[PDB]
Amino acid sequence: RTVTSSLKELYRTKLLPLEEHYRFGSFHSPALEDADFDGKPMVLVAGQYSTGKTSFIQYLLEQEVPGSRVGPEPTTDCFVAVMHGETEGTVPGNTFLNRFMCAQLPNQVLESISIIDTPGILSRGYDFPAVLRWFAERVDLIILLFDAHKLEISDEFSEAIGALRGHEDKIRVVLNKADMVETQQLMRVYGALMWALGKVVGTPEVLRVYIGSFWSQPLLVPDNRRLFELEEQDLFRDIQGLPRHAALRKLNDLVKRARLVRVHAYIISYLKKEMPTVFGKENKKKQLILKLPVIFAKIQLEHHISPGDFPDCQKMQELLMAHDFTKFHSLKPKLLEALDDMLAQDIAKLMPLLRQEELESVEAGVAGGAFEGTRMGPFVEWVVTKDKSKYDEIFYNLAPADGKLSGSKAKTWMVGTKLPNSVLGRIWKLSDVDRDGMLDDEEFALASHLIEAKLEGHGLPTNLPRRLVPPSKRRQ
Amino acid sequence: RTVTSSLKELYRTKLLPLEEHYRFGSFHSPALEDADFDGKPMVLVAGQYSTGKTSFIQYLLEQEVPGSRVGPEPTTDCFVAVMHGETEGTVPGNTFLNRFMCAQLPNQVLESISIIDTPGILSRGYDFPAVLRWFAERVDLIILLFDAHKLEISDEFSEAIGALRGHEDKIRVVLNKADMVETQQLMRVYGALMWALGKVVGTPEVLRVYIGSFWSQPLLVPDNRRLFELEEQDLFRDIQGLPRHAALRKLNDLVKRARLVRVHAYIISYLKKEMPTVFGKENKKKQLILKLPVIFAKIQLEHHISPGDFPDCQKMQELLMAHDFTKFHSLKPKLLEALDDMLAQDIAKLMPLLRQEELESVEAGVAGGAFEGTRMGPFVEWVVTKDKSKYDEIFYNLAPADGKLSGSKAKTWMVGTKLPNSVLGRIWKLSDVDRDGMLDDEEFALASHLIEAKLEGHGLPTNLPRRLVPPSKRRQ
Numbered sequence: 033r034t035v036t037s038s039l040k041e042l043y044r045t046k047l048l049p050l051e052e053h054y055r056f057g058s059f060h061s062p063a064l065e066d067a068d069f070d071g072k073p074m075v076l077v078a079g080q081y082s083t084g085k086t087s088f089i090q091y092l093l094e095q096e097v098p099g100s101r102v103g104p105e106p107t108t109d110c111f112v113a114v115m116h117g118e119t120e121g122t123v124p125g126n127t128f129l130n131r132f133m134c135a136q137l138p139n140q141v142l143e144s145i146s147i148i149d150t151p152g153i154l155s156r157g158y159d160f161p162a163v164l165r166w167f168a169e170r171v172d173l174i175i176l177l178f179d180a181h182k183l184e185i186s187d188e189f190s191e192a193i194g195a196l197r198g199h200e201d202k203i204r205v206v207l208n209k210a211d212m213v214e215t216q217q218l219m220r221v222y223g224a225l226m227w228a229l230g231k232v233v234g235t236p237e238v239l240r241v242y243i244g245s246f247w248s249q250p251l252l253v254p255d256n257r258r259l260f261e262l263e264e265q266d267l268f269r270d271i272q273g274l275p276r277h278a279a280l281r282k283l284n285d286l287v288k289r290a291r292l293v294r295v296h297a298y299i300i301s302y303l304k305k306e307m308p309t310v311f312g313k314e315n316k317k318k319q320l321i322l323k324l325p326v327i328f329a330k331i332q333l334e335h336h337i338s339p340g341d342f343p344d345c346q347k348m349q350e351l352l353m354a355h356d357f358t359k360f361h362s363l364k365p366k367l368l369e370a371l372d373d374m375l376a377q378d379i380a381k382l383m384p385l386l387r388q389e390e391l392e393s394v395e396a397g398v399a400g401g402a403f404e405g406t407r408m409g410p411f412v413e414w415v416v417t418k419d420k421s422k423y424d425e426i427f428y429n430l431a432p433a434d435g436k437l438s439g440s441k442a443k444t445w446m447v448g449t450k451l452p453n454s455v456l457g458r459i460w461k462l463s464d465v466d467r468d469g470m471l472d473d474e475e476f477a478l479a480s481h482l483i484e485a486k487l488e489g490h491g492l493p494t495n496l497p498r499r500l501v502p503p504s505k506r507r508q
Numbered sequence: 509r510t511v512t513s514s515l516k517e518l519y520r521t522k523l524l525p526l527e528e529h530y531r532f533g534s535f536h537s538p539a540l541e542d543a544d545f546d547g548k549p550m551v552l553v554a555g556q557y558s559t560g561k562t563s564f565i566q567y568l569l570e571q572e573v574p575g576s577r578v579g580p581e582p583t584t585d586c587f588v589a590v591m592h593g594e595t596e597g598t599v600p601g602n603t604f605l606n607r608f609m610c611a612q613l614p615n616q617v618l619e620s621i622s623i624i625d626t627p628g629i630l631s632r633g634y635d636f637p638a639v640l641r642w643f644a645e646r647v648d649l650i651i652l653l654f655d656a657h658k659l660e661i662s663d664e665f666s667e668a669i670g671a672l673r674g675h676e677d678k679i680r681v682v683l684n685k686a687d688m689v690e691t692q693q694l695m696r697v698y699g700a701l702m703w704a705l706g707k708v709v710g711t712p713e714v715l716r717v718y719i720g721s722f723w724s725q726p727l728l729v730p731d732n733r734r735l736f737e738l739e740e741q742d743l744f745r746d747i748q749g750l751p752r753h754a755a756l757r758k759l760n761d762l763v764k765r766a767r768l769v770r771v772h773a774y775i776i777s778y779l780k781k782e783m784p785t786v787f788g789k790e791n792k793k794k795q796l797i798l799k800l801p802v803i804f805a806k807i808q809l810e811h812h813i814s815p816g817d818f819p820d821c822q823k824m825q826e827l828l829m830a831h832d833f834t835k836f837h838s839l840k841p842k843l844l845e846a847l848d849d850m851l852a853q854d855i856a857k858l859m860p861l862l863r864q865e866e867l868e869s870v871e872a873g874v875a876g877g878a879f880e881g882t883r884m885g886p887f888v889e890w891v892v893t894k895d896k897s898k899y900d901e902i903f904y905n906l907a908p909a910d911g912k913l914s915g916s917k918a919k920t921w922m923v924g925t926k927l928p929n930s931v932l933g934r935i936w937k938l939s940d941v942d943r944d945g946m947l948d949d950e951e952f953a954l955a956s957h958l959i960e961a962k963l964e965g966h967g968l969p970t971n972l973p974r975r976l977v978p979p980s981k982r983r984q
């Protein structure tokens with residue numbers, strides 16, 4: 033009596049019949065079970081060799097994976113479905129599953145979701161893309177890893193991303209080990225990545241990248257850790273927030289499928305309606321698949337669907353090559369109508385019910401692993417105008433240019449204050465506000481203030497706060 | 509007797525004749541003067557409204573521009589050639605120059621180079637792109653500004669970048685005012701920019717962006733200033749290093765032009781060779797321009813040039829529309845040969861002479877403005893193993909889980925040390941190395957060490973250095 037229930041009935045009564053009639057199962061997807069309506073949300077981790085997928089998961093679980101280890105040059109070569117289970121251990125599952133393993137372990141995260149770990153994308157066994165597309169159809173989130181340490185986008189990869197088409201909304205691109213590269217360089221890599229991806233996925237809507245280094249190791253180059261913890265938090269929120277709304281992603285994928293189904297129905301229908309009854313069959317067919325892009329196109333001319341909805345002409349050509357046309361069924365306006373109406377109105381009403389559900393129970397939310405909150409720790413006019421005239425007395429007794437004291441002179445004086453170099457350098461950096469290399473009266477008074485401050489026994493700030501900036505400070 | 513000299517003669521004797529014969533001047537570019545061989549290198553600053561072009565220049569010169577002011581909503585509407593001169597002031601210059609102004613001022617930077625400032629690209633007066641292309645042909649560097657504060661890539665802009673085609677090597681993309689946006693957001697914008705640009709310019713080679721805020725104002729959000737000063741330094745080196753090698757960029761642009769010339773020569777030649785002597789002229793022409801892409805293409809079939817070398821078919825169609833075919837000249841293998849040979853062998857020998865020149869005088873280098881060096885300022889096993897057993901005594905007297913002390917307990921103890929919260933929080937952050945939220949024995953000993961340290965009267969580090977990381981530290 034819930035919403036996924038409603039989705040399921042909608043499917044069974046409105047979609048399934050059309051799929052079965054135009055034999056969707058032998059072209060794109062087999063019919064769905066209850067298992068893909070009533071099962072734990074999956075996240076998929078993909079990327080090329082040594083990008084840290086396994087590490088990433090290890091890190092999400094803050095626990096080691098029974099079957100999967102981690103190493104320098106490529107180690108594991110198959111799909112590991114990291115999922116819940118009462119015992120620690122493993123179990124290895126026309127179709128081929130010997131390239132498929134299953135790991136189980138008592139762990140809350142695995143209560144909330146399950147994480148399927150993939151083989152590394154090469155920088156000739158199966159139809160990797162095809163499987164990525166199958167998962168893409170089924171899965172809740174797709175994590176793509178790039179490592180800022182060895183930026184590479186292989187052909188195979190861009191084929192994979194080609195295969196994730198229509199599901200970009202499920203993609204989280206994470207740029208890993210950003211902590212093992214000097215920052216400028218990071219900028220360089222990030223830039224390259226987004227350029228590349230930009231050209232590759234081709235959508236006008238930009239993918240979010242999460243910048244960090246997903247492992248409990250110390251940070252190599254630490255001067256960016258704020259950003260890393262932040263990005264990590266964002267992604268974690270995104271993952272942790274999955275169980276709360278699977279209904280929505282389900283609904284949505286149902287819509288997408290629907291659209292594809294409708295398209296293909298039209299395709300077969302038209303082919304069948306083009307076929308001659310008894311003789312000529314052969315070449316009317318071969319030619320008919322010679323004229324496929326014409327078909328798709330015209331069908332767009334007179335039906336209103338998006339280039340986004342159509343399958344691949346050539347693959348569809350392979351398969352169409354495999355089928356018998358005379359056996360195809362004809363256009364059936366009834367079932368179609370059922371469809372159009374379904375999505376339109378029925379999904380219309382499911383929306384409101386959905387919202388009402390989308391404020392129900394955060395209990396479903398993913399519980400501690402790398403998610404636990406205790407992991408962040410248990411903890412969390414102008415002042416110199418009084419001494420100005422004095423400072424000025426000094427400053428002007430130091431013979432400045434035209435209001436600006438040379439850097440060298442400033443230094444000799446400063447070092448004259450018998451303070452250690454380091455402190456002084458920091459003070460300089462703090463005081464040279466327009467940062468030209470000299471010190472004018474105000475900047476100088478500031479410097480002096482800071483020197484006195486340190487003399488009293490005061491840690492210096494690391495960034496000059498507004499209240500200390502000479503009043504020629506900043507518009508707002 | 510120098511290299512630009514040699515270039516000039518090469519041009520005059522090997523290129524000019526071909527241009528003049530196939531009337532290059534009435535299609536792409538007029539013939540060159542000595543003035544574009546013997547003149548001060550230009551840099552061009554472009555971008556859309558309020559991106560800070562004028563500010564950028566102001567900042568490069570560390571001086572205000574006589575004619576050009578700066579404001580909130582769009583202010584200046586023309587081209588300002590900021591160039592050297594003995595007096596401060598201005599002077600306003602079929603062609604139209606009333607959209608052109610000239611400013612002069614005594615200033616070293618203006619001794620080394622001149623900077624042409626442009627109107628803001630709208631987010632119907634002239635052929636903006638065309639002029640950007642003319643400058644692109646002539647100019648040494650092209651600065652494109654985007655502001656991290658209002659990321660927008662207008663149609664007009666992408667038309668401009670479309671117009672910079674073939675000269676991307678001269679492009680420095682700078683993302684301005686990066687200091688007025690929180691860092692994550694910066695990442696977001698940068699990402700967007702590179703995605704967009706990626707899709708727009710279309711080359712497999714990625715453009716460098718320089719991230720900063722080019723003005724002497726204080727920094728809004730300061731926690732990225734290292735990067736900003738760094739990027740600034742890189743760009744400055746790039747600009748400052750121009751006079752040192754104009755010969756190279758000249759040579760190179762000469763090559764590029766050559767290639768274009770050759771192409772177009774072929775085009776006209778073929779058209780003329782297709783034209784019928786006395787009658788039929790009319791439609792053989794109109795049709796001949798109906799079949800232009802066919803021409804270009806076949807000419808690639810049988811001549812070996814790159815899609816990179818060909819003009820725009822449609823524009824060439826407008827102009828071809830303007831010309832008389834019977835007046836065109838025929839293919840002249842001689843002049844062409846002269847060309848091919850020129851670039852090939854002659855440029856071959858110019859290279860070595862060039863290198864010898866490219867180690868001659870850095871004196872030409874741009875002198876102080878924002879370039880002066882004095883602007884950066886006048887300034888620039890494990891230790892706890894001894895007290896370990898003691899610390900451990902405490903740690904284990906605190907009843908930890910299985911080697912890990914809960915965060916709350918750790919806190920009560922720490923706060924027990926009667927240190928201020930802030931310090932303690934910092935210490936925590938420093939000590940929780942695997943950053944899970946508890947403290948194991950080593951991490952705890954570290955914490956203790958740090959606490960004692962602060963008690964003695966010691967500033968805390970801001971980043972735990974390797975020598976202090978418990979020996980389970982980091983692979984290398």
Ligand SMILES: Nc1ncnc2c1ncn2[C@@H]1O[C@H](COP(=O)(O)OP(=O)(O)NP(=O)(O)O)[C@@H](O)[C@H]1O
Nearest residue numbers: 081082083084085086087102106107152209245246
């Ligand atoms: N965040 C990180 N920063 C730096 N190094 C890392 C990080 N994560 C993992 N590594 C190291 O980089 C390598 C990648 O390890 P791994 O986690 O196996 O990647 P992977 O994607 O599982 N490789 P594969 O499964 O063979 O495609 C290992 O040697 C790790 O020790």
Ligand SMILES: Nc1ncnc2c1ncn2[C@@H]1O[C@H](COP(=O)(O)OP(=O)(O)NP(=O)(O)O)[C@@H](O)[C@H]1O
Nearest residue numbers: 557558559560561562563578582583628685721722
């Ligand atoms: N680095 C910076 N950070 C923040 N704000 C800036 C920066 N540079 C300039 N501004 C402000 O942003 C606006 C842009 O000023 P301006 O230098 O005139 O840009 P512009 O590109 O010359 N505009 P236009 O010539 O009309 O296209 C002005 O109000 C400046 O005060």
Ligand SMILES: [Ca+2]
Nearest residue numbers: 464468470471
């Ligand atoms: Ca100063």
Ligand SMILES: [Ca+2]
Nearest residue numbers: 940944946947
């Ligand atoms: Ca810890």
Ligand SMILES: [Mg+2]
Nearest residue numbers: 085086101108
């Ligand atoms: Mg692995």
Ligand SMILES: [Mg+2]
Nearest residue numbers: 561562577584
């Ligand atoms: Mg301006």
